[PDB]
Design an enzyme around this catalytic site. Sequence first.
Site, short mmCIF file in Angstrom:
data_model
loop_
_atom_site.label_atom_id
_atom_site.label_comp_id
_atom_site.label_asym_id
_atom_site.label_seq_id
_atom_site.Cartn_x
_atom_site.Cartn_y
_atom_site.Cartn_z
N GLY A 23 0.88 -1.16 0.06
CA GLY A 23 -0.04 -0.07 -0.02
C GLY A 23 0.88 1.24 -0.05
O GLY A 23 2.13 1.16 -0.23
N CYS A 30 4.94 0.76 1.00
CA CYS A 30 5.22 -0.24 1.83
C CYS A 30 5.00 -1.64 1.16
O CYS A 30 4.29 -1.88 0.60
CB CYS A 30 4.19 -0.33 3.01
SG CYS A 30 4.34 -1.56 4.27
N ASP A 139 -3.77 10.23 16.72
CA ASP A 139 -4.30 9.78 15.37
C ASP A 139 -4.80 8.30 15.48
O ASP A 139 -3.98 7.45 14.77
CB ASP A 139 -3.33 10.18 14.21
CG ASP A 139 -3.66 9.96 13.00
OD1 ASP A 139 -2.92 9.81 12.10
OD2 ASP A 139 -4.97 10.19 12.66
#
Length: 261
Positions: A23, A30, A139
């Site tokens: 991805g 990655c 996050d």
Amino acid sequence: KEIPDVLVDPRTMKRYMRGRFLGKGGFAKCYEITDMDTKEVFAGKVVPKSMLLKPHQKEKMSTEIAIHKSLDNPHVVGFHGFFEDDDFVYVVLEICRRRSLLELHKRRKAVTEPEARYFMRQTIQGVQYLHNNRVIHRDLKLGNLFLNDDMDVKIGDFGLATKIHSFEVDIWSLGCILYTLLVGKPPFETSCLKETYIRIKKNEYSVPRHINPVASALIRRMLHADPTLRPSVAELLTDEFFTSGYAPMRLPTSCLTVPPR
Ligand SMILES: Cc1nn(-c2cccc(CCC(N)=O)c2)c2cc(N[C@@H](C)c3ccccc3)ncc12
């Protein structure tokens, strides 16, 4: 500029073989990388230095690495050393071949309660480790809640993590998650980005009546406007929601696409 077929570092001097694409998060691709000597497989974040030419952005990632490195817990993505060459920064991480709880949500929409009980528990236990070790995630989204082939939730993407608003932002993020899992839609989701930020500010959300009272009750507390009236990590596990109803210890892989039986 091409990413090398074999990845090596001056420190450990281990040779990794860049395998299947997995991805792309922002400007970071990655790949599933493999130790050419041991055959142990890892998810390698490859960030090109052309993004870190500015010493400002070059600090933010050196903080993400700094923190993640120090961590060790079965509900945080394992860290196994970073390294750089002349063109790319390479972060070596634990492999999660079942994608993130987001993928599960998108495909499943509203999951059954026990599933949320299982995911939340495991997720929270990670969040405790972090808060206990004075780490805030800041996050936390279903995308940060990765899944291995054993269906264990493992927290990742510490790109906005900070060591010591305070801890209560994470208890907020987990509220959204528990909402999204049980309700099937995010509590503050809209197409307009400005609208979402307003909904959040004015604390505008409505839990459907179809949701369990005990569930909604907790969901209200976790998203409560006064950050100091939000529960603590330790107070979550003990909540009626986790203790009243059935809570599975293992989940089948089937849960990625259909409800379990
Ligand atoms: C650690 C770690 N970081 N990333 C990762 C890196 C870059 C972009 C992204 C997608 C966007 C996002 N959620 O941030 C994920 C992994 C992917 C997988 N597994 C693969 C199967 C996967 C692929 C897409 C999403 C989740 C997992 N396992 C472990 C990791």
